[PDB]
């Protein structure tokens, strides 16, 4: 089985610096050229950057080119991406690649072999989220469907985790997906779908945990009455 | 670079239906065309190389097809393990290598209309400065839904963002989040704030709304 490990993503500044690693098992390294590609949040692929079996030909994507240098240590069976003057278009999951064809260098281009792939985020500062209750209100019949839910509000980076009831309540829980504000900051909401007879009687608390600034916030939501 | 097309964006498909998946290329590529899929939370595998030649272990429903500027990919018989995003890459002029922009095979399901309420901006949220307004579709398919605010009669634009859900695991339907955000300053000198869903399971776009102080 061969096996492609990337590591070295996390955090970091725009303008700055890092150094992503991909450890290769499983096959003869030398004898294969070895490829990043890329993958921005809710995206497609990207080809970054590529490098011969012999290590003396590199390209680049045109957008990376001056701020990324691809690199191999062929007899410690390693891949490296150096990335310098990171833009926030940069922020990724990175994947090494491995071409499936040895010795005909005109049929290089296919990728048989992907590694899970390593996260990298550009960040301007670690924010928790504020928590604010999205109340039921007599809006829904008090004989069908209500709503209810909390509204987990300027953060950064992903993810933040929310239950209800301390995960006692998990049926009809919809959690969206983080979406970036203009300010650069993440905004989501958590809605849950009860009926409109346990207003009042059922209690209802949602449980958000931010673990990048050790957030925890446990927010009563409760019905307005107009 | 050579830009490649794939349309249609999503392929609504049930098990065992016949599913075919169009990629496209702005200059000839020759028969040096790849196919990837690519499943949530996973690294691409490869399916198909050389446009027609199936990857080690793929299994025979997958077909590929075409030249020069014109390519599919065709699943005989739709597995539920095949629901998935499938990508198509040229090899013929690199650097650069590029992907078309992906084809969802999406799981189909009847027309399921959307159940529709709206949250005003909570007092503590005020209280900082600002005002979120959330209108919230619940379990909808298909995922095409129309949003509009209306703030004392007024539309909206500009100011709302949407969120939409990965289809539900259970039973397929999409909900979506639609959220206004306005300063504490603008929401208070406006009382009714509405939000009107026009989707095709509603045979009349359905509008939910509140009074700001009431």
């Known amino acids: 089985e061969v096996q492609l490990l990337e590591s070295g993503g996390g955090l970091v500044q725009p303008g700055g610096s890092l150094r992503l690693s991909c450890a290769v098992s499983?096959?003869?390294?030398?004898?294969?050229?070895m490829n990043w590609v890329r993958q921005a949040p809710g995206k497609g692929l990207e080809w970054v950057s590529h490098?011969?079996?012999?290590?003396?030909?590199?390209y680049y994507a045109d957008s990376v080119k001056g701020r990324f240098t691809i690199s191999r240590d062929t007899s410690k069976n390693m891949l490296y991406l150096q990335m310098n003057s990171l833009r926030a278009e940069d922020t990724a999951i990175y994947y090494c690649?491995?071409?499936?064809?040895?010795?005909?260098?005109?049929?290089?281009?296919?990728?048989?072999?992907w590694g899970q792939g390593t996260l990298v985020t550009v960040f301007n500062q670690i924010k928790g989220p504020s928590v604010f209750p999205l109340a039921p209100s007599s809006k829904s019949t008090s004989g069908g469907t209500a709503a209810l839910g909390c509204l987990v509000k300027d953060y950064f980076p992903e993810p933040v985790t929310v239950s209800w009831n301390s995960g006692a309540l998990t049926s009809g829980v919809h959690t969206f997906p983080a979406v970036l504000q203009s300010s650069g900051l993440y905004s989501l909401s958590s809605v849950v779908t009860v009926p409109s007879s346990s207003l009042g009687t059922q209690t209802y608390i949602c449980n958000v945990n931010h673990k990048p600034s050790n957030t925890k916030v446990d927010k009563k939501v409760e019905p307005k009455s107009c | 670079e050579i830009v490649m097309t794939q349309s249609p964006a999503t392929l609504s498909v049930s098990p065992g239906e016949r599913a075919t998946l169009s990629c496209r290329a702005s200059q000839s590529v020759s028969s040096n065309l790849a196919w990837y899929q690519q499943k949530p939370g996973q690294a691409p595998r490869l399916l198909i190389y050389g446009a027609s030649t199936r990857a080690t272990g793929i299994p025979p429903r997958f077909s590929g097809s075409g030249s020069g500027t014109e390519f599919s990919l065709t699943i005989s018989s739709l597995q539920s393990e095949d629901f998935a995003v499938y990508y198509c890459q040229q090899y013929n002029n690199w650097p650069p290598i590029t992907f078309g922009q992906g084809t969802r095979l999406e799981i189909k399901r009847t027309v399921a209309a959307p159940s529709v309420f709206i949250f005003p901006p909570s007092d503590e949220q005020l209280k900082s400065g600002t005002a979120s307004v959330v209108c919230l579709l619940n379990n909808f398919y298909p995922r095409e839904a129309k949003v509009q605010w209306k703030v004392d009669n007024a539309l909206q634009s500009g100011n709302s963002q949407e969120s939409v859900t990965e289809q539900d695991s259970k039973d397929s339907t999409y909900s979506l989040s639609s959220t206004l955000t306005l300063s504490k300053a603008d929401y208070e000198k406006h009382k009714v704030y509405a939000c009107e869903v026009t989707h095709q399971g509603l045979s009349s776009p359905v509008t939910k709304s509140f009074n700001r102080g009431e």
């Open positions: 499983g096959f003869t390294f030398s004898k294969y050229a």
């Open positions: 690649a491995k071409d499936a064809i040895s010795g005909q260098i005109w049929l290089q281009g296919t990728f048989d072999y």
């Open positions: 490098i011969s079996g012999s290590g003396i030909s590199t």
